[PDB]
Amino acid sequence: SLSEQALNHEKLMRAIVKNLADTPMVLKGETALYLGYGLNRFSEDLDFDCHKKINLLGRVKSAIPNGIILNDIHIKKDTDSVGRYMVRYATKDNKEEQTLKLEISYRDAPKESEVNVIEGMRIAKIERIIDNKLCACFDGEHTRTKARDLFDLHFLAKHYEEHFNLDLASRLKDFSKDPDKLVSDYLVDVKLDALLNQIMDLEETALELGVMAQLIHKKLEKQSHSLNALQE
């Protein structure tokens, strides 16, 4: 769009992720879609998988780009299974303190062969992002109700349909079968979410996703039925 505040935020996020390209850290989730795959809404948090501990504090400080001032890094959590940091910073454009949230999950880690590199950044593959989005908003242990999940899944079905398999498509179809329910579930969150409220038509998105999920699932079935006949 994009505000000057957002621009400095993106610049700090990019420097950090690029700094970690020689570590086993893998960017996932929403900001992976934004920095790596062309997501058309902004994203502000950094989320990683990593199979072992690293010098996070050191890499972050050595990543700080010109124009950004690092005030403090607060370690909310550093355990065997999770890392959670609040990177507090200001800019030359503004001395008002901003926060970058950085989270890491350990032994979630993708195999090294499940990692992409995009513009010098280690990022999760699309199918893993899809799988994790569906878990979080539809069929995981602890689901949630955040309109971003709908926006992102719609973005994924629309622009990356070739990365869905039968299982992902089937779940996406299940999730999106009742477009009215989706509107009911998300309308409040959409209007309150400043990353969405000016760009998202919730009704259109809900309708369009339900139908795309049908198509994707249908194509994959026809592909399967066709493959079998050919195999004989």
Numbering used by the authors: 11 to 242
Text lifted from the article:
JHP933, a conserved putative protein of unknown function, is encoded by the gene in plasticity region of H. pylori strain J99. Our work demonstrates that JHP933 is a nucleotidyltransferase superfamily protein with a characteristic αβαβαβα topology. Most NTase fold proteins can transfer nucleoside monophosphate (NMP) from substrate nucleoside triphosphate (NTP) to the hydroxyl group of their second substrate, such as a small molecule, nucleic acid or protein. The molecular details regarding the function of JHP933 are unknown due to the lack of sequence similarity with other well-characterized proteins.
